Amino acid sequence: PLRKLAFADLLQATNGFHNDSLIGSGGFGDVYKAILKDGSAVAIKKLIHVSGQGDREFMAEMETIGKIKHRNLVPLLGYCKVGDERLLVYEFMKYGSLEDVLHDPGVKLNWSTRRKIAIGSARGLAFLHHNCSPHIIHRDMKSSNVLLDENLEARVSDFGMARLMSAMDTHLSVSTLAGTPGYVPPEYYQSFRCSTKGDVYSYGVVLLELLTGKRPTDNLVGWVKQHAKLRISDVFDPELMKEDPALEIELLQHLKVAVACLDDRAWRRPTMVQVMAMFKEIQA
């Protein structure tokens, strides 16, 4: 069940929102690591800009991730909405974000693990797009929003910009442009519309990060697309090919999936269900 947590609890569990428990801040607000009075290990997000972006993002998460549970989505355990304070409480994910692991410090992700992360994150997204009615459009898929639990299982997070779309529709007309530089679907720049195929594109970028080990802003999408006609054995993460040269065939197949996801035309991109089926076909 989703719990309504007393504000005093979150206050003392973070030692009065002390800098020492701060594990991230910016844009949306802060994220704190804590142990609740019952021993639960949690991440506590403190949203800022409550008079505007703050409340909207709070409501977006409550209306989406707050209403569903799935093995590849971060669990929202609780919330606190007192006065103009907006806090969201999640199960703590041991190894933080995929971006932290890939672009900082740390912990090594071999190809086997990265493949599981790719599959897991794809499954979470597929659940949003196909199993949920109304469908959920995440709108901010990226490596910092793929969390890794104690088993290095991928769990999709940050539904602050997520929206509900009727299953009878192919797109949703919105008020603003949502997303992150390096991940925005090209058609999002041209129209105030979002779609599940938009999430597919952004997922494609993440899959590229797993294959290359590079940041999207290095864009990466364009850099990989041009080398796809040059030398393919140049874009892959060196630490992946050093493991086993035999993995090259499997890497290129996953690369094909990423390229398909990253098509400029939304209508040509696969659904996340097609992506899963493709992953399954590669393993077999």
Side-chain angles (χ1 to χ4, degrees), residues 52-80 82-103 105-107 109-115 117-150:
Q53 128 177 355
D55 189 42
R56 190 59 182 100
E57 295 188 21
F58 179 84
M59 296 298 300
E61 297 200 38
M62 290 289 291
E63 289 181 351
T64 56
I65 188 59
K67 296 286 189 175
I68 58 182
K69 290 293 192 300
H70 185 282
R71 69 186 73 95
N72 295 115
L73 306 176
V74 65
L76 181 58
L77 303 184
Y79 65 92
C80 176
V82 290
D84 286 316
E85 286 297 323
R86 308 291 172 186
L87 297 114
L88 294 164
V89 183
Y90 313 85
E91 185 184 319
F92 185 79
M93 299 289 97
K94 190 171 182 186
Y95 292 102
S97 80
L98 173 63
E99 190 185 49
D100 290 335
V101 182
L102 281 184
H103 303 327
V107 171
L109 308 175
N110 55 26
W111 173 238
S112 179
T113 303
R114 297 193 183 187
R115 181 180 65 232
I117 290 169
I119 294 173
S121 63
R123 185 160 42 231
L125 231 45
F127 181 83
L128 301 181
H129 300 169
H130 303 90
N131 295 80
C132 294
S133 188
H135 304 331
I136 295 175
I137 307 177
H138 186 283
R139 278 211 302 175
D140 205 17
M141 181 64 168
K142 53 177 170 179
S143 58
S144 70
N145 283 345
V146 176
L147 304 188
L148 303 178
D149 62 29
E150 71 218 292

Side-chain angles (χ1 to χ4, degrees), residues 237-240 244-247 250-255 257-280:
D237 196 333
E239 296 291 342
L240 257 52
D244 194 339
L247 283 187
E250 180 167 2
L251 289 177
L252 275 174
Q253 288 180 308
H254 287 79
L255 178 53
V257 178
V259 174
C261 291
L262 292 167
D263 198 282
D264 289 327
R265 307 154 292 184
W267 69 266
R268 192 71 166 259
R269 297 171 199 151
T271 66
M272 293 311 299
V273 169
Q274 272 170 318
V275 166
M276 292 289 291
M278 273 180 283
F279 286 156
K280 177 182 176 184

Side-chain angles (χ1 to χ4, degrees), residues 165-167 169-211:
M165 181 189 66
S166 168
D169 295 331
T170 51
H171 72 266
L172 180 67
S173 317
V174 292
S175 66
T176 60
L177 162 66
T180 306
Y183 297 93
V184 185
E187 73 273 14
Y188 281 25
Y189 288 116
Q190 307 174 284
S191 29
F192 287 98
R193 300 188 184 126
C194 63
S195 68
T196 58
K197 292 301 191 69
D199 286 346
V200 166
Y201 179 94
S202 298
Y203 170 84
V205 183
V206 175
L207 182 48
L208 270 201
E209 296 183 72
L210 285 162
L211 289 169

Side-chain angles (χ1 to χ4, degrees), residues 18-37:
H18 204 56
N19 199 22
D20 296 14
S21 54
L22 185 63
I23 65 174
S25 60
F28 54 88
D30 329 324
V31 184
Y32 300 86
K33 167 185 53 182
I35 298 168
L36 297 184
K37 58 180 176 179

